[PDB]
Scaffold this motif. Structure first.
Motif, PDB file in Angstrom:
ATOM      1  N   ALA A   1     -24.412   3.190 -41.573  1.00 58.35           N
ATOM      2  CA  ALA A   1     -25.072   3.734 -40.400  1.00 58.35           C
ATOM      3  C   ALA A   1     -24.844   2.831 -39.198  1.00 58.35           C
ATOM      4  O   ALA A   1     -24.734   1.611 -39.325  1.00 58.35           O
ATOM      5  CB  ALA A   1     -26.571   3.907 -40.647  1.00 58.35           C
ATOM      6  N   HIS A   2     -24.762   3.447 -38.025  1.00 57.16           N
ATOM      7  CA  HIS A   2     -24.624   2.718 -36.772  1.00 57.16           C
ATOM      8  C   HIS A   2     -25.328   3.532 -35.686  1.00 57.16           C
ATOM      9  O   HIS A   2     -26.118   4.430 -35.988  1.00 57.16           O
ATOM     10  CB  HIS A   2     -23.142   2.428 -36.475  1.00 57.16           C
ATOM     11  N   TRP A   3     -25.059   3.209 -34.425  1.00 57.95           N
ATOM     12  CA  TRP A   3     -25.760   3.811 -33.295  1.00 57.95           C
ATOM     13  C   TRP A   3     -24.757   4.460 -32.355  1.00 57.95           C
ATOM     14  O   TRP A   3     -23.922   3.768 -31.770  1.00 57.95           O
ATOM     15  CB  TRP A   3     -26.576   2.762 -32.538  1.00 57.95           C
ATOM     16  N   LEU A   4     -24.839   5.785 -32.204  1.00 57.83           N
ATOM     17  CA  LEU A   4     -24.083   6.423 -31.132  1.00 57.83           C
ATOM     18  C   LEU A   4     -24.746   6.243 -29.782  1.00 57.83           C
ATOM     19  O   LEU A   4     -24.060   6.097 -28.769  1.00 57.83           O
ATOM     20  CB  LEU A   4     -23.894   7.914 -31.374  1.00 57.83           C
ATOM     21  N   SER A   5     -26.070   6.293 -29.731  1.00 55.14           N
ATOM     22  CA  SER A   5     -26.763   6.251 -28.457  1.00 55.14           C
ATOM     23  C   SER A   5     -28.037   5.443 -28.599  1.00 55.14           C
ATOM     24  O   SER A   5     -28.789   5.628 -29.559  1.00 55.14           O
ATOM     25  CB  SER A   5     -27.077   7.666 -27.961  1.00 55.14           C
ATOM     26  N   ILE A   6     -28.262   4.543 -27.656  1.00 56.17           N
ATOM     27  CA  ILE A   6     -29.511   3.808 -27.530  1.00 56.17           C
ATOM     28  C   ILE A   6     -30.168   4.306 -26.252  1.00 56.17           C
ATOM     29  O   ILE A   6     -29.709   3.974 -25.151  1.00 56.17           O
ATOM     30  CB  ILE A   6     -29.295   2.293 -27.493  1.00 56.17           C
ATOM     31  N   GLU A   7     -31.233   5.109 -26.408  1.00 58.31           N
ATOM     32  CA  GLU A   7     -32.015   5.813 -25.382  1.00 58.31           C
ATOM     33  C   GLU A   7     -31.175   6.461 -24.281  1.00 58.31           C
ATOM     34  O   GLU A   7     -31.607   6.545 -23.132  1.00 58.31           O
ATOM     35  CB  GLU A   7     -33.112   4.897 -24.785  1.00 58.31           C
ATOM     36  N   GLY A   8     -30.002   6.975 -24.638  1.00 61.14           N
ATOM     37  CA  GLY A   8     -29.127   7.653 -23.702  1.00 61.14           C
ATOM     38  C   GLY A   8     -27.798   6.966 -23.467  1.00 61.14           C
ATOM     39  O   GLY A   8     -26.839   7.627 -23.037  1.00 61.14           O
ATOM     40  N   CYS A   9     -27.698   5.669 -23.733  1.00 59.15           N
ATOM     41  CA  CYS A   9     -26.495   4.896 -23.461  1.00 59.15           C
ATOM     42  C   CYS A   9     -25.741   4.619 -24.752  1.00 59.15           C
ATOM     43  O   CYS A   9     -26.344   4.264 -25.771  1.00 59.15           O
ATOM     44  CB  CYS A   9     -26.838   3.573 -22.770  1.00 59.15           C
TER      45      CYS A   9
END
Lengths: 120, 25, 412, 90, 111, 52
Positions: free
Chosen positions: C128-136
């Motif tokens: 798992a990873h992050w495509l978006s952090i609160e929009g960014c």
């Protein structure tokens, strides 16, 4: 090649832009398998009619007697709508409240003691 | 073609050999 | 506008198949009747194999899609053979036939046994990873990419703090700190727009770090250069005009610190510098600017009379690591000069200088290069005393090195 | 129980096909590796089929040993009811 | 075939393959297209121009194909724009009747 | 051996392992089980004509 460059045009006419290189090689292997079972049956039908030349009615017979067995299709719409209305007329059954894990009868499930041989 | 971007990169327009420090002191 | 056509297989291929089966004297209307039936079945299956491509969420029709498209049309996926009874294999795909147009059509039966089997790849895992952090979208490697106003620096304070931490880690006080900072330089995607300040820190550092010959400071900076080069995101040939005279200085310079002992590292300082030098001539290449310029400086370093032997050894290494043909065309007419230099160091008693160490290193490196330069362009005949026509420098030991190279080739 | 005895002996037997490869094509069809001996019997059955075809093909080659050609596989599989196909398109 | 709307290329390619009768007798999608009726929602302002070009004997053959193979579902209103007709067509036997979309649907949530 | 004769025979070998995979799973799941015993393969190989 000759027949392999026409196979890349049958796919491109069907909009298949991306394909593996082994795709052309085995559609030619199917097309060769299909014509050597039409013409093999065509001379069987020619020897039945007792003619030394396999003419066009022999290939017309061998195509429609191979397409009657090999290439089938899903069931038709007048058959699907008849078995639907025969099935959708039966009302939904009620549910027993605490029957447990809701499963079919045990001869329709895959839950048996499932044995194995003793290692010796 | 003399207006190509590389012509203007300073590796192709600078005598950077003079920089190499030999026996400095 | 759509000029869509109906392409069928050629009929002159269908008569070849018919007469190679025992069915001779077929008419053209009989033969055209075969090639519109089978061209429909290819079109019927390729339209039906495109259903399995879309359902499997792929954009490439694999070889297994036609195996399921055939099974869907109640035709056996078997291509090589057809079983009339159908009981040994019932709609079971054998994976097709690995055949080619440019194949040999005959192999030896022990060639297939003695080849090594390919490596079974890794099993499927869930990361798992992050495509978006609160929009960014974050720039992680799992993601693709009248008074005038008081101006701001083009770096952020997180970026400026990052630059300070990476530079204070890359001066190698602790080794794990260095190694991470080097990997951070090697794969940060946003390390552009900070690259002028890194290039200036490298360049300025080597020049005030050869005033006193501080070997670690230099070995760390060369590792920083190597970590800057293998980063794929950043654009380096705007800054290579500062990078190249820094590495030439590591290779062609005298050592102000203790002459012996760390000369072993000094050879590696010249080994790391000659590695990154030939990697820089491999990349960034245009006509007659970079590689020929460093080749000319290396050759006039060599032909210069009465050199510093540290500079001599470094330039020798630099010209040595330039590839296959460069030693094939350059080291050839110079063996006599190398031998004369070795003889002078040997005769003069002076042992407390660094001349003798420089001479031994230069001779060993030149002899190894000459060994394959020979193993590469001639047979290994007369390996005993024919090398005495080349002043007898490496001779039988050179022949033994060539034999070791031949053994490595046999192992390959 | 001759075959039950044979399967019980199949532990400590290594077949020509590995169980990492026979078990791969069994997992592809839903057959999961509950017992190694069962995988080994399936591997040996496949081996016997290929070996019998090969031996029949060799009798045909000796009649017409050495190289195996498609014209040896063609009469060898014809008694099996399998019509093998030439490539003919490459 | 080339004056057909761009969104119909896939169906057009399946049809280009279909040239024989027995090729279509085992397709079962064009077999159900031939027996069903295209619904073809049109306005009454445009249907009056269509029926004044079809009720005449000059075009009684294409009028015979229309009233045999095509339903026409008429609504009383403005004729739709081209980028609004493009938004709601695209299917085979498509743009279904409003009498199908008028049944009472219990689209609310349970308690 | 000929090259096309080896990719033929290894295609009949993969199709043979994949056919005892699909049919012995079908014979055990017909008897409400999930993993096949010896009695499910000696009926699978009989239905392929093997002479076990």
């Amino acid at each position: 090649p000759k027949d392999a460059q026409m196979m890349a045009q049958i796919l491109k006419d069907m909009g298949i832009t991306e394909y593996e290189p082994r795709v052309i090689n085995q559609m030619l292997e199917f097309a060769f398998r299909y014509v050597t079972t039409i013409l093999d049956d065509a001379k069987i039908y020619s020897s039945h009619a007792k003619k030394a030349t396999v003419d066009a009615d022999d290939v017309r017979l061998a195509i429609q007697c191979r397409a009657d067995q090999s290439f089938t299709s899903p069931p038709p719409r007048d058959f699907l709508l008849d078995i639907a209305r025969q099935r959708n007329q039966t009302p939904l059954p009620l549910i027993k409240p605490y029957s447990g894990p809701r499963l079919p009868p045990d001869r329709y499930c895959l839950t048996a003691p499932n044995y194995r041989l003793k290692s010796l | 073609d003399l207006l190509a971007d590389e012509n203007f990169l300073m590796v192709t327009q600078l005598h950077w050999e003079d920089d190499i420090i030999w026996d400095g002191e | 506008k759509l000029k869509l056509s109906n392409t069928v297989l050629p009929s002159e291929s269908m008569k070849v198949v018919a007469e190679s089966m025992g069915i001779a004297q077929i008419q053209e209307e009989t033969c055209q009747l075969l090639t519109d039936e089978v061209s429909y079945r290819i079109k019927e299956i390729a339209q039906d194999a495109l259903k399995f491509m879309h359902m499997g969420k792929r954009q490439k029709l694999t070889t297994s899609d036609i195996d399921y498209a055939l099974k869907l049309k109640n035709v056996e996926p078997l291509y090589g053979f057809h079983a009339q009874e159908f009981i040994p294999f019932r709609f079971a795909s054998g994976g097709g036939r690995e055949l080619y147009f440019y194949e040999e059509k005959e192999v030896d039966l022990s060639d297939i046994i003695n080849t090594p089997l390919p490596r079974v790849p890794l099993d499927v895992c869930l990361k798992a990873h992050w495509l978006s952090i609160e929009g960014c979208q974050p720039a992680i490697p799992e993601n693709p990419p009248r008074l005038k106003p008081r101006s701001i620096h083009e770096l952020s304070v997180e970026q400026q703090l990052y630059y300070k931490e990476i530079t204070e880690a890359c001066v190698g006080s602790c080794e794990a700190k260095r190694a991470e900072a080097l990997q951070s330089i090697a794969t940060d995607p946003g390390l552009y727009q900070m690259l002028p300040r890194f290039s200036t820190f490298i360049s300025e550092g080597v020049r005030v770090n050869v005033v006193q010959n501080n070997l670690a400071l230099l070995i760390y900076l060369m590792r920083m250069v190597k970590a800057l080069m293998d980063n794929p995101t950043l654009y380096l040939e705007k800054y290579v005009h500062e990078l190249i005279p820094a590495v030439m200085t590591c290779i062609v310079s005298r050592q102000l610190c203790l002459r012996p002992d760390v000369d072993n590292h000094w050879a590696l300082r010249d080994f790391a510098a000659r590695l990154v030098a030939q990697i820089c001539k491999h990349f960034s290449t245009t006509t007659n600017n970079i590689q020929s310029r460093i080749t000319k400086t290396f050759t006039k370093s060599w032909v210069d009379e009465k050199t510093p032997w540290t500079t001599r050894y470094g330039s020798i290494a630099g010209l040595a690591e330039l590839g296959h043909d460069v030693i094939k065309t350059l080291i050839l007419p110079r063996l006599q000069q190398e031998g004369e230099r070795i003889r002078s160091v040997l005769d003069g008693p002076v042992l407390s200088n660094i001349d003798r160490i420089g001479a031994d290193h230069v001779q060993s490196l030149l002899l190894k290069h000459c060994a394959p330069v020979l193993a590469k362009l001639r047979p290994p005949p007369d390996n005993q005393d024919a090398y005495r026509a080349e002043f007898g420098s490496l001779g039988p030991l050179l022949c033994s090195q060539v034999v070791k190279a031949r053994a490595q080739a046999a192992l390959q | 129980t001759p075959l039950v005895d044979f399967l019980m002996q199949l532990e400590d037997y290594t077949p020509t096909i590995p169980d990492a490869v026979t078990g791969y094509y069994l997992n592809r069809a839903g057959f999961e590796a509950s017992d190694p001996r069962i995988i080994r019997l399936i591997s040996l059955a496949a081996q016997k089929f290929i070996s019998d075809i090969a031996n029949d093909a060799l009798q045909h080659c000796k009649m017409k040993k050495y190289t195996l050609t498609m014209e040896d596989l063609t009469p060898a599989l014809s008694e099996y009811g399998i019509n093998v196909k030439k490539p003919h398109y490459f | 075939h080339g004056d057909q709307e761009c969104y119909y290329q896939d169906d057009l390619r399946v049809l280009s393959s279909l040239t024989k009768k027995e090729h279509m007798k085992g397709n079962e999608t064009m077999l159900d297209f031939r027996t069903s009726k295209f619904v073809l929602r049109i306005s009454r302002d445009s249907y009056q121009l269509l029926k004044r070009h079809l009720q005449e004997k000059q075009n009684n053959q294409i009028w015979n194909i229309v009233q045999e193979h095509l339903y026409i579902d008429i609504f009383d209103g403005m004729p739709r724009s081209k980028q609004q007709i493009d938004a709601m067509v695209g299917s085979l036997a498509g743009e279904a009747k409003r009498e199908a979309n008028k049944s009472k649907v219990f689209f609310g949530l349970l308690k | 051996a000929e090259k096309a004769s080896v990719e033929t025979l290894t295609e009949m070998l993969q199709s043979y392992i994949s056919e005892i995979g699909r049919s012995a799973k079908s014979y055990c799941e017909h008897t409400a089980r999930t993993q096949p015993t010896l009695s499910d393969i000696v009926v699978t190989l009989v239905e392929m004509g093997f002479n076990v």
